[PDB]
Amino acid sequence: EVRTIKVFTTVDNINLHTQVVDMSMTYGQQFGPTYLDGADVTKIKPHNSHEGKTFYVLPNDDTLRVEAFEYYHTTDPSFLGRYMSALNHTKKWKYPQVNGLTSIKWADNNCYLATALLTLQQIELKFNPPALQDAYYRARAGEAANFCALILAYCNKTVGELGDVRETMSYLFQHANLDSCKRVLNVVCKTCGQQQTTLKGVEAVMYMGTLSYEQFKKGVQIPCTCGKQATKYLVQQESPFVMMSAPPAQYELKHGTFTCASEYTGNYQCGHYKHITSKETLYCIDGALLTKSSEYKGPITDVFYKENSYTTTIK
Ligand SMILES: Cc1ccc(N)cc1C(=O)N[C@H](C)c1cccc2ccccc12
Ligand SMILES: [Zn+2]
Known part of the structure; x- marks a missing residue:
């Protein structure tokens, strides 16, 4: 016997294609790999209830x-x-x-x-x-x-x-x-001199070294090829935000001075992330659990700060 039903096949769930499926044959044997709300139905055969539903192929x-x-x-x-x-x-x-x-x-x-x-x-x-x-x-x-x-x-x-x-x-x-x-940085060594660098795209809103956006404006110490401690500071920032990252270290988050932060507790590749957010006060969002406090000390690895345009006043 051959009974058939009407289903929709898609790759995006916007453009639905209208298929007639042989119920005496599997979904895999007709289309190839077929998924229904994520579930792999390749080896499964069509059912009565499946009539009119969308399938990812x-x-x-x-x-x-x-x-x-x-x-x-x-x-x-x-x-x-x-x-x-x-x-x-x-x-x-x-x-x-x-x-x-x-x-x-x-x-x-x-x-x-x-x-x-x-x-x-x-x-x-x-x-x-x-x-x-x-x-x-x-x-x-x-x-x-x-x-x-x-x-x-x-x-x-x-x-x-x-x-x-x-x-x-x-x-x-x-x-x-x-x-x-867009991001303009000026690196200043006391022996070698000045160096300016422009960064466009993902490079412009991501830094790995310090969490403090204040310290990145003030200036941070980096080893120059001189073998002498050079100062890198933010000349100009054009972005909707900046993401300051560093390996997890005990850090003080102050209400208003940032947007949100990623706390990491545990060892490399096997720890636990928590979300700290600045609103009317500091909130620690731990999945479904919520604690609030005025002050916060903890092992922070990312801070996100909002921005539009910044220009330095250092000379
Ligand atoms: C959770 C996770 C998944 C995949 C990969 N590849 C890495 C991590 C991870 O360890 N991240 C944390 C923040 C981390 C980053 C850099 C240095 C760290 C040194 C000591 C402790 C944590 C450190
Ligand atoms: Zn130098």
């Missing part, structure tokens, strides 16, 4: 490969599989509204995603792939499963693998409109 024709690229801004043929793999787990996460922000309830080493999400809700970042733009707007409302699964997909991470926030944000900043972001 691999872009295995010239039409779907163009729709895929235009949406995800990647031609990596493993991408959709790794997104669907991740999504299948992240749809079972709880996304509670903590301090009027979308956070994640701890599960499968997602502490770094939770702080990365809370950060992205607080800084002005414009994503280029329509996939992230769409997923993020849902994430703000509290439907963050599609966003988290994309972050894991874009960053080449499996569910349960702890990730570096600075490494994660770097990846996402590649897929962000940071075009007109």
